[PDB]
């Protein structure tokens, strides 16, 4: 079940903050695909 969890952390400009934050559930889409591989989509 393609479970998507996320968080926007608009706080640490330079790079990985090292900060402690936590992601929240968003959606659990019932796709049922084996999804061995994936790729990005860029504008």
């Amino acid at each position: 079940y393609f479970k998507i969890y996320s968080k926007h952390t608009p706080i640490i400009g330079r790079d990985f903050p090292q900060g402690f934050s936590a992601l929240e559930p968003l959606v659990d889409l019932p796709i049922g695909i084996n999804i061995t591989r994936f790729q990005t989509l860029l504008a």
Partner: protein
């Protein structure tokens, strides 16, 4: 319910006993594996009066060959040729 799904399909009478957790056979293994930890209801009824044809209704297909068993709620509609023998044949083949 919280998140409920209704799965609609047509099976043979001798396969009704396979749509249950823990079952094996051509349906449980190659068409649809139901999770062993399963919550829900399986409702089945005879449709001979609706689906059968005198000449035979061939619209309904059953998968008989696959290279592995399915995981819970997995669906695979690929029609790629399966090799039943040792030769790596393509297309309809001597052991394909």
């Amino acid at each position: 319910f919280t998140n409920v799904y209704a799965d609609s399909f047509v099976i043979k009478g001798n396969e009704v006993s396979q749509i249950a957790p823990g079952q094996t056979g051509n349906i449980a293994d190659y068409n649809y594996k139901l999770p062993d930890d399963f919550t829900g209801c399986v409702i089945a009824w005879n449709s001979n009066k609706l689906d059968s044809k005198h000449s035979g209704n061939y619209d309904y297909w059953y998968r008989s060959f696959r290279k592995s068993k399915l995981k819970p709620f997995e669906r695979d509609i690929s029609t790629e040729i399966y090799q039943a023998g040792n030769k790596p044949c393509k297309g309809k083949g001597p052991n394909c």
